A and B are shown apart, each in its own frame.
Chain A
Amino acid sequence: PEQAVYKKLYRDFPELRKDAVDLSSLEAPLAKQFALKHLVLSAEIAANSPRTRHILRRDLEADPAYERLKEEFMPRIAELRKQQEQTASLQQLQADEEEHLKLALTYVAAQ
């Protein structure tokens, strides 16, 4: 039952595809820890909900547990990202665009 949440987890946090995992081990990596917590809390929230006269389909298609765990696991994933390769910042990208704009203007001025 807990293999369905991984698709969303990898989509929102692609950096979890870089952390190496030991297949033949009993220790759970960060990705597996999130899945187990989602399974546990999903049932808990559903049970701990006031009952109403009728059942609504909109509630059946909601998942507040995923949002809660994402907030909790946000700081931990940040450390994993730092362990990966660095990338150019926003300021550097804008500078590169400005230089290319100036080059285009110079070519127009020449011609």
Chain B
Amino acid sequence: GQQIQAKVIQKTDEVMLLDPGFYNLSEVPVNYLTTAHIVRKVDDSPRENLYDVRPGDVVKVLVDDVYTPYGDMQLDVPQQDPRLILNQVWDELHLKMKKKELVRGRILNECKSGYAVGVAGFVALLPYANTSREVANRVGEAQSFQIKSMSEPHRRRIVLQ
């Protein structure tokens, strides 16, 4: 699951060889990599095609596995995950709490402890003790709220006032 730097050794018609620097050489499809994964170039000569990686370059790869039945490391192109999108939103919410900013949320339904308020994919808790019964009645319309407390990123708990 960790990204490592590998050096291109051979580039054949079918397969390309990469050196992870740990043990036996790894194999990758010829056209799997692109010029956007290069961090260090052997030479400064401009490249023409997107799938133009020359031997000697250093590329970023993702370690899918360490032990494989073939006997070599498994390396795959890095990919994306929405978890970062939520993390970026969470950081923004934390900054708003520090700066005492007003957050906009939409009430979805009623909850045991209070009311459920959604904030860009995060469902917060609004205890009835801090509601005027007018905001509670308004469902599906954005309203201003003040963030009071929040849990650690894994827990994903927010309390609104």
Chain A interface residues (CB < 8 Å from chain B):
11-12, 14-15, 17-24, 84-85, 87-90, 93-94, 97-98, 101
Contact = CB atoms under 8 A, between A and B. Distances in A.
A55 to B, nearest CB: 28
Interface stretch (B48-56, B77-85, B124-132): B77-85
B3 A17 contact: yes
B84 A20 contact: no
A87 B5 contact: no
A24 B22 contact: yes
Contacts of B80: 85
Given A20-B60, A24-B22, A90 B92 contact: yes
Interface residues of B, number: 29
Contact of B4 (A11, A22, A93): A22
Interface string B19-50: 01110000000000000000100000000000
B154 interface: yes
B55 to A, nearest CB: 18
B78 A18 contact: yes
B3 A87 contact: no
27 contacts: A11-B153, A11-B154, A12-B152, A14-B87, A17-B1, A17-B2, A17-B3, A18-B3, A18-B78, A20-B5, A20-B60, A21-B2, A21-B4, A21-B5, A22-B5, A22-B21, A23-B4, A23-B22, A84-B84, A85-B84, A90-B92, A90-B93, A93-B121, A97-B106, A97-B120, A98-B142, A101-B140
B150 interface: no
Given A90-B120, A94-B120, A23 B85 contact: no
Interface of B: 1-5, 20-22, 39, 60, 78, 80, 83-85, 87-89, 92-93, 104, 106, 120-121, 140, 142, 152-154
Contacts of A11: 153-154
B153 A94 contact: no
A93 B105 CA distance: 12
Contacts of B21: 22-24
B104 to A, nearest CB: 6
A18 B79 CA distance: 10
Contacts of A89: 88, 92
